[PDB]
Amino acid sequence: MNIFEMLRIDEGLRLKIYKDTEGYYTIGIGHLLTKSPSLNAAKSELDKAIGRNCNGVITKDEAEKLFNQDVDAAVRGILRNAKLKPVYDSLDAVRRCVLINMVFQMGETGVAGFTNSLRMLQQKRWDEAAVNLAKSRWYNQTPNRAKRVITSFRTGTWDAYKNL
Numbered sequence: 001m002n003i004f005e006m007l008r009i010d011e012g013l014r015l016k017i018y019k020d021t022e023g024y025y026t027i028g029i030g031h032l033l034t035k036s037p038s039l040n041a042a043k044s045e046l047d048k049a050i051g052r053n054c055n056g057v058i059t060k061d062e063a064e065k066l067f068n069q070d071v072d073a074a075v076r077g078i079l080r081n082a083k084l085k086p087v088y089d090s091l092d093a094v095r096r097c098v099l100i101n102m103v104f105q106m107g108e109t110g111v112a113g114f115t116n117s118l119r120m121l122q123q124k125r126w127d128e129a130a131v132n133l134a135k136s137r138w139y140n141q142t143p144n145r146a147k148r149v150i151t152s153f154r155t156g157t158w159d160a161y162k163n164l
Contacts, residue, residue: 001158003071003097007104009164010145013063017042017056021142028063030104031070074100077108084108087118095121098152105145106138121153130154 011030017039020026025033025042033045039056046054050062058066078084078099088099099121102111112118114136120129130150133139139146148160 001161003100004067006097006101006158006161007067007071009161010101010105010148013060015058015060015063017046027058027066029067029070031063031066070104071100074104074108078103081108081112083112083118087122090122090124092156094156094158095153098149101149101152110138126154126156 008029013029014027017025017027017033020030020032024035025039025045027033027046031049033042033049036042043054043056046056046058049066050058078088084099084103088096091099099111114133117129117132120126120132130153133150133153134146136146139150151160152158
């Protein structure tokens, strides 16, 4: 299991513009297009992102390209962020993927806000950190995904995804 497979499980693949869990216009593998209520705004962002007139629809290849970009941008974001970098550097391979999953979903800024949890992961207090992470809007809103993530940090293995 790797970061792409893991995110492909959590986000799904959709080749037509759709609304995410929060109501935002999204495409492919969790690629947010716009927070704007306008489907047109969305289709506009899409064409700009793909470089073609897509009329709200993309190909598998195009979804994967956006996916490649997104994951890269997530890793680079972590590496450039003063709060995240040290956490990431302190973690093992599996847990690093897990942090990436969070950043892909909620953005750098969003994860960097989880001060206490970050500190606990840094300290390798797995159980404590799992309980702290569970006390969030994130968890309450997407509990099945959050639980997979939390369990992954908890055990440091891919069991939660070997199911799926």
